[PDB]
Structure formats: structure tokens, C-alpha cells
């Protein structure tokens, strides 16, 4: 009915055949078949190997198919040693890709809504005395996919919906009518930031990025009436002090609360707080919070140099950001708007060269911590120095400079007198 990305056949190059469960027992069949449930295996939780025809787990001496409740016996297998053990008790690879047996490990799958607070599915689990190796629509009404979060639903009755990878928003998302972006606020869940990351990824989505004041106010609008602190995609992890959105959105808009971010050492992940009234803080990525997901289904004059259908030049005369912009206008251009990493590397290495810092034209003059290119071009990417943009020591820093070897960006008071770069 559904897909099965993690099921594989277990194939011996010692013999020529792949493992199956026929009868009650397990043998090697040269008749390898991807379609036959007896031959196809899935790693499940607690180091167990589940066979789809038997709906049972490999066990041990000898080898057998046994119900997976029956933890007793062994049923515990480790993928590095699995081949050596088959050789001794009956070389081995996954069939057809010939890769090692650790290539399709068991991953946890976090549950949407239900009573389990987002807790991961327990695979396999018993419901109505049947065993299941994944999500089913059985026992439900509506048809939706759910699993148990306990290994016997009859006893504990702890369950939740399955993350779906969909190109639509049906039933689990709020849609902003104006932007057609979809959002999921999981308030019951308590997950670490990395588990939340994994959960939005499992739905074909990604953790919340707030790229603009509209998006922020829509978020506030959906949070009216709650008290809560949720994970967002904003995080410090990938390199320390430089903030990034989980999805690769440019950091174009900043809602940090007053005197955030703090604790640069172990507080690496952002949260949105109804308390702050939608303000942002950073926190320790290991605490368990609710969390938010989203998805949206003629070369030039002398002294200018070409890059990618545009022209660039250095203006060496030290001037305020505003006067620099005027000198660019007097030519055929505006201050340089930067939409590529390749473009930043050309600018920094070929043009900036030894000059330490110059104006680039990215500015929050119109609305604080909402950054714009002077030429009206969309801000599609940023590269900031760590802890920038800060409006430093609580002063207005309304204009952006490139600084230092790497070409990372700083916000600065605009009356500062520096060089600049233009493009047309």
C-alpha cells in the first residue's frame, strides 16, 4: 500500500543467495526476489531485525522467526557483526547495492499530536493482537496514519499520528492566506532542538524561519491566547556565534528580545516566546520544548570589472554610507547588492583585496533589524560576522560593511567614513 524506504534483502556473497524466512525457519535462497515478503528485512528498535512475511523477528545454536515481544532469547543484533554471525550459525551485503549492513539503520520517528507528547513510535508494536512494523490507518476512522508510542497499545494506549511527507498542508498545518506558507505549532510535544529538527524534516518540512516582519506578525497572530516557548530554526551550532536559519533562509529580519542573544557557550538554539510577545531567545539545545515547522510547497566601461552579467568597481574615497551611495549613483550604479556566495568571493578577493572594511549597501535604515539592499533587490542571502548584526552597545547601526579576510558583514553607524563597492 505504502512505500518502504528502509527495507532491504540480506544477500550472501559467500553463498549466492539472500536470506529468507520460509516455514518457521530461515535459509539462503539463490532465487533472490525483492517482491517476496519472506526475503525483505527491516531494522527495528532495540537492535531487532524484522521480517515482513513472518511479521516476526530473527532470533537465536540456530536461527528462527519469533514474535518480537519475546525479548528474552536474544533477538539483539549489531549490524557490524551480523554478517560474521550469519556465517557462523547458518560475505554478506545489502542486496543489489552491495553495501554494508549498517547502511539502513533504524531511525526514530516523532509523533504528531496524540497523547504521547511527540514521543517516537515504538517499532514494532502490537495493536488488536496484530503486530505492525510501521504506520497504519487501521483502527481509525478518518484513515490517517498513526502508531503506538508503547509497544502494546492495548495496555498503555499511548499513540500519535505519523509525520507525513506531503506537498500539501491537509489537516496538520495552518496556512497564511497571504503568502501560502504553511505552519505547524506542536504545543503538546516536548522535544530537544535536534529531535524537532528531525521531526520537521520527517514531514518534508523544516523548522520555523522568520524572514520578515509580516511573517513575524502572522506568527504572533497564531500565538494569541497561549503561554509557551517553542523551538525555531534559528541556531548557533554550525559555527560558533554565527546565527543561521535551519532552512537556508538569509538572516534578513531579527526579532531578538532585549539583551538576547546571551550565553554564547551552551545556548545555541533559538526559541520564540509568547512571553516576549513573539520575541526570540537562545537556549540550550538539549531542553525539551514544543516547536514550529513550516513549508512552502553588455560588458562594461573601463575601471569596472564583469561578474555574472553585472559590473563592479571599488570606490576608494572614504565617505559616509550615504555619500558613498551618491557617488555610486553618479556612475551607472548603486551600492553592491550580493546574492551569491560566488559573488561574495569575487567581491572580497578580487575587488576588496587589502582594504579592511567598506560599505556594501545592505541597510536597516527604514526599519530596525529589517535589512534591505539600497537597490531594492530581494535579500536572498547574508554572510554575517558572528554576533552581528548587533546595533552595538545599544547604538543605531543602520548600514552594512564588508570587513576582514572572509568578507563577513557588520552593521555600523552610517556616518562612518569608509570606501565602498558599486555594481550595475
Instruction: Identify which of residues 25 and 417 has a Cβ nearer to ligand NAG in the complex.
Output: 417
Tell me, residue by residue from 356 to 385, as one string, x for binding to Ca ion by CB under 5 A and - for no binding: --------x---------------------
Give the DSSP letter of residue 142: T
Among 6, 33, 190, 274, binds ligand NAG (CB under 6 A): 33
Beta bridge partner(s), residue 147: 160
413 contacts 396 by C-beta, under 8 angstroms: yes
Among 22, 74, 391, 416, binds Ca ion (CB under 5 A): 391
The entry of Ca ion, ligand NAG, Na ion, none near residue 398 (CB within 5 to 8 angstroms by kind) is Ca ion
Instruction: Identify which of residues 37 and 204 has a Cβ nearer to ligand NAG in the complex.
Output: 37
Instruction: Identify which of residues 245 and 359 has a Cβ nearer to ligand NAG in the complex.
Output: 359
307 is a contact residue toward Ca ion (CB under 5 A): no
Instruction: Identify which of residues 117 and 383 has a Cβ nearer to Ca ion in the complex.
Output: 383
Instruction: Determine which helix (DSSP H) or strand (DSSP E) holds 11, and give its type and residue range.
Output: strand 8-12
Candidate segments 175-183, 260-268, 306-314, 327-335, binder of Na ion by CB under 5 A: 260-268
Instruction: Return the residue matching grid coordinates 502494546.
Output: 152
SS3 295: strand
220 is a contact residue toward ligand NAG (CB under 6 A): no
- List b or e across 367-398, with b for residues whose CB sees 16 or more CB atoms inside 10 angstroms: eebbbbbbeeeebebbbbbeebbbbeeeeebb
Candidate segments 38-46, 227-235, 259-267, 268-276, binder of Na ion by CB under 5 A: 259-267
- Minimum distance, C-beta of residue 401 to Ca ion, in the bound complex (Å): 9
State the cell numbers at 178.
497571504
403 closest CA partner among 381, 424, 388: 388
- Minimum distance, C-beta of residue 367 to ligand NAG, in the bound complex (Å): 20
Alpha-carbon distance of 379 to 105, in angstroms, equals 39
Instruction: Identify which of residues 267 and 397 has a Cβ nearer to ligand NAG in the complex.
Output: 397
Among 372, 411, 414, 423, binds Ca ion (CB under 5 A): 411
Instruction: Identify which of residues 115 and 415 has a Cβ nearer to ligand NAG in the complex.
Output: 415
Contacts 24+ apart (CB under 8 A), 132-140: 133/42, 133/44, 133/50, 133/52, 133/55, 134/2, 134/4, 135/2, 135/162
22 is a contact residue toward ligand NAG (CB under 6 A): no
35 is a contact residue toward ligand NAG (CB under 6 A): yes
Beta bridge partner(s), residue 269: 235, 283
Candidate segments 125-133, 244-252, 276-284, 396-404, binder of Ca ion by CB under 5 A: 396-404
Among 146, 358, 398, 403, binds Ca ion (CB under 5 A): 398
Alpha-carbon distance of 6 to 2, in angstroms, equals 12
**Separation of CA 170 from chain center:** 21
Binding to Na ion in span 274-293, by CB under 5 A: 281
Pairing, β 146-148 against β 159-161: antiparallel
Binding to ligand NAG in span 364-423, by CB under 6 A: 413, 415-416
Instruction: Identify which of residues 280 and 359 has a Cβ nearer to ligand NAG in the complex.
Output: 359
The entry of ligand NAG, Na ion, Ca ion, none near residue 411 (CB within 5 to 8 angstroms by kind) is Ca ion
Instruction: Identify which of residues 262 and 345 has a Cβ nearer to Na ion in the complex.
Output: 262
Alpha-carbon distance of 329 to 352, in angstroms, equals 19
Instruction: Identify which of residues 129 and 227 has a Cβ nearer to Na ion in the complex.
Output: 227
- Minimum distance, C-beta of residue 254 to Ca ion, in the bound complex (Å): 9
Alpha-carbon distance of 208 to 189, in angstroms, equals 15
Beta bridge partner(s), residue 43: 49
Torsional sign, CA 191, 192, 198, 201: positive
Alpha-carbon distance of 311 to 330, in angstroms, equals 15
The entry of ligand NAG, Na ion, Ca ion, none near residue 340 (CB within 5 to 8 angstroms by kind) is none
Which residues here bind Na ion, judged by CB under 5 A? 262, 281
Chain contacts with ligand NAG (rule: CB under 6 A): 33-36, 413, 415-416
Residues that bind Ca ion (CB under 5 A): 364, 390-392, 397-398, 410-411
Amino acid at each position: 500500500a505504502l512505500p518502504e524506504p528502509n527495507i532491504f534483502l540480506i544477500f550472501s556473497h559467500g553463498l549466492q543467495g539472500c536470506l529468507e524466512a520460509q516455514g518457521g525457519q530461515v535459509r539462503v535462497t539463490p532465487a533472490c526476489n525483492t517482491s517476496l515478503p519472506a526475503q525483505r528485512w527491516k531494522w527495528v528498535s532495540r537492535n531487532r531485525l524484522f521480517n515482513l512475511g513472518t511479521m516476526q523477528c530473527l532470533g537465536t545454536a540456530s536461527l528462527g522467526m519469533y514474535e518480537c515481544d519475546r525479548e528474552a532469547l536474544n533477538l539483539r543484533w549489531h549490524c557490524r557483526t551480523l554478517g560474521d554471525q550469519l556465517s557462523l550459525l547458518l560475505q554478506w551485503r545489502i542486496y543489489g547495492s552491495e553495501e554494508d549492513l549498517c547502511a539502513l539503520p533504524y531511525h526514530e520517528v516523532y509523533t504528531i499530536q496524540g497523547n504521547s507528547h511527540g514521543k517516537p513510535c515504538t517499532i514494532p508494536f502490537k495493536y488488536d493482537n496484530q503486530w505492525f512494523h510501521g504506520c497504519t490507518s487501521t483502527g481509525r476512522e478518518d484513515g490517517h496514519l498513526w502508531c503506538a508510542t508503547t509497544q502494546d497499545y492495548g495496555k498503555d494506549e499511548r499513540w500519535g499520528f505519523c509525520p507525513i511527507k506531503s506537498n500539501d498542508c491537509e489537516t496538520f498545518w495552518d496556512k497564511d492566506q497571504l503568502t501560502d506558507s504553511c505552519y505547524q505549532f506542536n504545543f503538546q510535544s516536548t522535544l530537544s532542538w535536534r529531535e524537532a529538527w528531525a521531526s520537521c524534516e520527517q514531514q518534508g518540512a523544516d523548522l520555523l524561519s522568520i524572514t520578515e516582519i509580516h511573517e513575524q506578525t502572522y506568527i504572533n497572530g497564531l500565538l494569541t491566547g497561549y503561554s509557551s516557548t517553542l523551538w525555531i530554526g534559528l541556531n548557533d551550532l554550525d559555527t560558533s556565534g554565527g546565527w543561521q536559519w535551519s532552512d537556508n533562509s538569509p538572516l534578513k529580519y531579527l526579532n531578538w528580545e532585549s539583551d538576547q542573544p546571551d550565553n554564547p557557550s551552551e545556548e545555541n538554539c533559538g526559541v520564540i516566546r509568547t512571553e516576549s510577545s513573539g520575541g526570540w531567545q537562545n537556549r540550550d539545545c538539549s531542553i525539551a520544548l514544543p516547536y514550529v515547522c513550516k513549508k512552502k510547497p553588455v560588458e562594461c566601461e573601463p575601471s569596472w570589472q564583469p561578474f555574472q552579467g553585472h559590473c563592479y568597481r571599488l570606490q576608494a574615497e572614504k565617505r559616509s554610507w550615504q555619500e558613498s551611495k551618491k557617488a555610486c549613483l553618479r556612475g551607472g550604479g548603486d551600492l553592491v547588492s550580493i546574492h551569491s556566495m560566488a559573488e561574495l568571493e569575487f567581491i572580497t578577493k578580487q575587488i576588496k583585496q587589502e582594504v579592511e572594511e567598506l560599505w556594501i549597501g545592505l541597510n536597516d535604515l527604514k526599519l530596525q533589524m529589517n535589512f534591505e539592499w539600497s537597490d531594492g533587490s530581494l535579500v536572498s542571502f547574508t554572510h554575517w560576522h558572528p554576533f552581528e548584526p548587533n546595533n552595538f552597545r545599544d547604538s543605531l547601526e543602520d548600514c552594512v560593511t564588508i570587513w576582514g579576510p572572509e568578507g563577513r558583514w557588520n552593521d555600523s553607524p552610517c556616518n562612518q567614513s569608509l570606501p565602498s563597492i558599486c555594481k550595475k
